[PDB]
Write a protein that holds these residues in place. Sequence first.
Motif, PDB file in Angstrom:
ATOM      1  N   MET A   1      -9.959   4.067  -4.851  1.00  8.88           N
ATOM      2  CA  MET A   1      -8.681   4.457  -4.177  1.00  8.88           C
ATOM      3  C   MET A   1      -8.699   3.674  -2.899  1.00  8.88           C
ATOM      4  N   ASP A   2      -7.576   3.055  -2.580  1.00  9.54           N
ATOM      5  CA  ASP A   2      -7.501   2.276  -1.350  1.00  9.54           C
ATOM      6  C   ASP A   2      -7.860   3.303  -0.232  1.00  9.54           C
ATOM      7  N   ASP A   3      -8.742   2.958   0.694  1.00  8.50           N
ATOM      8  CA  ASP A   3      -9.117   3.948   1.744  1.00  8.50           C
ATOM      9  C   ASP A   3      -7.986   4.417   2.706  1.00  8.50           C
ATOM     10  N   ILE A   4      -6.962   3.616   2.985  1.00  6.13           N
ATOM     11  CA  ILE A   4      -5.881   4.200   3.854  1.00  6.13           C
ATOM     12  C   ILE A   4      -5.212   5.347   3.115  1.00  6.13           C
ATOM     13  N   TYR A   5      -4.874   5.054   1.872  1.00  4.60           N
ATOM     14  CA  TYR A   5      -4.241   6.035   1.045  1.00  4.60           C
ATOM     15  C   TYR A   5      -5.078   7.313   0.987  1.00  4.60           C
ATOM     16  N   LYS A   6      -6.394   7.188   0.981  1.00  2.00           N
ATOM     17  CA  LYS A   6      -7.258   8.341   0.720  1.00  2.00           C
ATOM     18  C   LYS A   6      -6.957   9.543   1.607  1.00  2.00           C
ATOM     19  N   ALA A   7      -6.432   9.304   2.797  1.00  2.00           N
ATOM     20  CA  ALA A   7      -6.113  10.415   3.683  1.00  2.00           C
ATOM     21  C   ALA A   7      -4.646  10.724   3.949  1.00  2.00           C
ATOM     22  N   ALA A   8      -3.727   9.934   3.430  1.00  2.00           N
ATOM     23  CA  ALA A   8      -2.470  10.548   3.105  1.00  2.00           C
ATOM     24  C   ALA A   8      -2.757  11.529   1.998  1.00  2.00           C
ATOM     25  N   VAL A   9      -3.503  11.096   0.983  1.00  2.00           N
ATOM     26  CA  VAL A   9      -3.619  11.869  -0.252  1.00  2.00           C
ATOM     27  C   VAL A   9      -4.440  13.156  -0.032  1.00  2.00           C
ATOM     28  N   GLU A  10      -5.290  13.153   1.003  1.00  2.00           N
ATOM     29  CA  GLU A  10      -6.036  14.350   1.425  1.00  2.00           C
ATOM     30  C   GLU A  10      -5.135  15.467   1.991  1.00  2.00           C
ATOM     31  N   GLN A  11      -3.863  15.184   2.248  1.00  2.00           N
ATOM     32  CA  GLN A  11      -2.911  16.203   2.698  1.00  2.00           C
ATOM     33  C   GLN A  11      -2.441  17.071   1.521  1.00  2.00           C
ATOM     34  N   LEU A  12      -2.707  16.614   0.307  1.00  2.00           N
ATOM     35  CA  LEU A  12      -2.134  17.260  -0.867  1.00  2.00           C
ATOM     36  C   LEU A  12      -3.181  18.144  -1.516  1.00  2.00           C
ATOM     37  N   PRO A  52      14.786  11.218   0.624  1.00  2.00           N
ATOM     38  CA  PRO A  52      14.613  10.010   1.428  1.00  2.00           C
ATOM     39  C   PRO A  52      15.915   9.208   1.549  1.00  2.00           C
ATOM     40  N   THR A  53      16.151   8.646   2.742  1.00  2.00           N
ATOM     41  CA  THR A  53      17.366   7.909   3.001  1.00  2.00           C
ATOM     42  C   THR A  53      17.209   6.489   2.420  1.00  2.00           C
ATOM     43  N   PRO A  54      18.335   5.828   2.142  1.00  2.00           N
ATOM     44  CA  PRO A  54      18.237   4.460   1.581  1.00  2.00           C
ATOM     45  C   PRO A  54      17.477   3.482   2.482  1.00  2.00           C
ATOM     46  N   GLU A  55      17.652   3.532   3.805  1.00  2.00           N
ATOM     47  CA  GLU A  55      16.868   2.594   4.659  1.00  2.00           C
ATOM     48  C   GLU A  55      15.374   2.965   4.585  1.00  2.00           C
ATOM     49  N   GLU A  56      15.091   4.272   4.442  1.00  2.00           N
ATOM     50  CA  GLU A  56      13.720   4.701   4.455  1.00  2.00           C
ATOM     51  C   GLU A  56      13.004   4.189   3.209  1.00  2.00           C
ATOM     52  N   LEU A  57      13.661   4.331   2.060  1.00  2.00           N
ATOM     53  CA  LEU A  57      13.043   3.874   0.808  1.00  2.00           C
ATOM     54  C   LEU A  57      12.625   2.402   0.912  1.00  2.00           C
ATOM     55  N   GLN A  58      13.481   1.569   1.474  1.00  2.00           N
ATOM     56  CA  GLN A  58      13.122   0.157   1.608  1.00  2.00           C
ATOM     57  C   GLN A  58      11.964  -0.001   2.584  1.00  2.00           C
ATOM     58  N   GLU A  59      11.993   0.764   3.673  1.00  2.00           N
ATOM     59  CA  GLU A  59      10.921   0.723   4.635  1.00  2.00           C
ATOM     60  C   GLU A  59       9.562   1.111   4.012  1.00  2.00           C
ATOM     61  N   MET A  60       9.535   2.200   3.226  1.00  2.00           N
ATOM     62  CA  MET A  60       8.291   2.625   2.596  1.00  2.00           C
ATOM     63  C   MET A  60       7.805   1.589   1.603  1.00  2.00           C
ATOM     64  N   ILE A  61       8.746   1.037   0.836  1.00  2.00           N
ATOM     65  CA  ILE A  61       8.373  -0.038  -0.026  1.00  2.00           C
ATOM     66  C   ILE A  61       7.722  -1.213   0.741  1.00  2.00           C
ATOM     67  N   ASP A  62       8.314  -1.632   1.853  1.00  2.00           N
ATOM     68  CA  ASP A  62       7.708  -2.715   2.654  1.00  2.00           C
ATOM     69  C   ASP A  62       6.318  -2.383   3.191  1.00  2.00           C
ATOM     70  N   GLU A  63       6.128  -1.132   3.610  1.00  2.00           N
ATOM     71  CA  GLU A  63       4.900  -0.698   4.304  1.00  2.00           C
ATOM     72  C   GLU A  63       3.764  -0.210   3.422  1.00  2.00           C
ATOM     73  N   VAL A  64       4.075   0.335   2.256  1.00  2.00           N
ATOM     74  CA  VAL A  64       3.044   1.013   1.417  1.00  2.00           C
ATOM     75  C   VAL A  64       2.652   0.134   0.264  1.00  2.00           C
ATOM     76  N   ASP A  65       3.576  -0.656  -0.245  1.00  2.00           N
ATOM     77  CA  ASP A  65       3.319  -1.321  -1.515  1.00  2.00           C
ATOM     78  C   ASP A  65       2.152  -2.289  -1.457  1.00  2.00           C
ATOM     79  N   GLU A  66       1.371  -2.307  -2.541  1.00  2.00           N
ATOM     80  CA  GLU A  66       0.167  -3.152  -2.709  1.00  2.00           C
ATOM     81  C   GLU A  66       0.518  -4.614  -2.942  1.00  2.00           C
TER      82      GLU A  66
END
Length: 86
Positions: A1-12, A52-66
Amino acid sequence: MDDIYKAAVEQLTEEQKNEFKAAFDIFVLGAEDGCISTKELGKVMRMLGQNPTPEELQEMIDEVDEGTVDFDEFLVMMVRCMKDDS
Ligand SMILES: [Ca+2]
Ligand SMILES: [Ca+2]
């Protein structure tokens, strides 16, 4: 698991992960496909109660995607979005 993700995912909780997976699975042919489209991303997030708002979806795609999102990317985007409730 990518380590940054590991602690977003620790919230769940395990149960949240299971619920999120069941929604995600509706939008793939899992026997051959690991990703949903960026068009489907907001649909699965809305199935899970997020708005999620339309600008947000694009933002998350830019920031999170592998144009595609796999399950762990999806979890991270859900966790980000869950923090903008009012
Ligand atoms: Ca539950
Ligand atoms: Ca359920």
